[PDB]
Amino acid sequence: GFVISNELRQQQSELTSTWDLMLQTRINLSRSAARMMMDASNQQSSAKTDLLQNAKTTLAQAAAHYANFKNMTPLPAMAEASANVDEKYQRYQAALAELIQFLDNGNMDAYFAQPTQGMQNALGEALGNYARVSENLYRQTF
Amino acid sequence: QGFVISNELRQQQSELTSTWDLMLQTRINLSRSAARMMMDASNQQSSAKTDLLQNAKTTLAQAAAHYANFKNMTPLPAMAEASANVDEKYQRYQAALAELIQFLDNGNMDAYFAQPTQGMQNALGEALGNYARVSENLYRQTF
Numbered sequence: 001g002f003v004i005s006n007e008l009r010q011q012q013s014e015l016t017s018t019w020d021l022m023l024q025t026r027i028n029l030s031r032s033a034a035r036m037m038m039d040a041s042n043q044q045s046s047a048k049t050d051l052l053q054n055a056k057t058t059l060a061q062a063a064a065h066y067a068n069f070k071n072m073t074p075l076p077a078m079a080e081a082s083a084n085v086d087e088k089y090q091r092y093q094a095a096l097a098e099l100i101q102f103l104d105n106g107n108m109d110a111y112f113a114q115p116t117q118g119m120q121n122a123l124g125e126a127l128g129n130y131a132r133v134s135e136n137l138y139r140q141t142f
Numbered sequence: 143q144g145f146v147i148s149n150e151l152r153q154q155q156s157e158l159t160s161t162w163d164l165m166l167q168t169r170i171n172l173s174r175s176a177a178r179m180m181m182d183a184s185n186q187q188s189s190a191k192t193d194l195l196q197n198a199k200t201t202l203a204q205a206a207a208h209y210a211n212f213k214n215m216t217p218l219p220a221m222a223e224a225s226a227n228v229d230e231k232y233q234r235y236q237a238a239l240a241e242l243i244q245f246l247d248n249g250n251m252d253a254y255f256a257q258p259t260q261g262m263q264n265a266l267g268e269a270l271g272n273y274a275r276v277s278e279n280l281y282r283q284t285f
């Protein structure tokens with residue numbers, strides 16, 4: 001709007017948007033899957049459905065919020081360094097989304113053994129690179 | 143002077159960011175215990191091994207540690223209305239979390255699953271977001 005940081009809060013602290021909704025979809029999936037183990041009988045097994053559909057929407061919302069950080073970068077400068085931040089986004093997005101198919105489908109054993117914490121971890125690392133090399137940097141250089 | 147203040151706000155928004163994010167990590171390792179505690183209605187044993195409950199214990203304590211840094215930074219006066227709010231909203235969202243650590247610690251599956259933790263959580267989000275919005279609206283150095 002005004003220069004950087006006006007366009008950077010709405011941009012990387014709007015990037016903080018995607019990371020909470022992707023983690024949210026993680027909590028919502030393992031509330032869904034625990035109830036799927038209840039299914040052999042009913043007493044509250046019932047919420048499962050609702051949490052899976054509404055797991056799918058937080059990973060949606062993440063996507064769209066990501067779509068502004070994309071449709072907001074005409075930027076680079078930090079360029080291919082934080083291009084990794086943009087690629088591993090896609091990597092976790094993809095994990096979580098398979099975790100929906102799997103669950104959605106009935107495949108619990110890959111649900112449980114698909115190593116989600118790692119695609120996650122990478123993106124922690126990746127946005128966690130960006131803010132460093134935004135913060136100490138466009139100050140030292142502009 | 144000038145600078146002083148613009149730099150408390152980033153340490154304070156970072157201590158608050160780390161509390162939130164880390165209290166969220168707690169949610170997910172706790173779920174992962176719960177989830178691996180329901181196994182075939184009642185499986186015989188394990189499911190898997192749930193260290194993950196100890197993991198949730200790690201992450202609660204280290205959420206609560208960046209919030210105890212946050213509570214020892216010099217209070218800007220303007221702000222105090224958002225912080226009172228935040229601390230309410232944080233203390234309760236921490237009790238909520240030790241309570242779920244406990245219901246799991248002692249195998250009370252039906253009471254874990256029963257607690258509205260998403261509600262106390264949501265309460266905190268709208269609080270951190272309102273401190274962050276008030277901050278802009280008060281000290282946004284535009285230009």
Ligand SMILES: N[C@@H](CC(=O)O)C(=O)O
Nearest residue numbers: 031254255257258259260
């Ligand atoms: N109290 C838990 C319920 C569940 O595990 O589904 C939550 O809201 O976090």
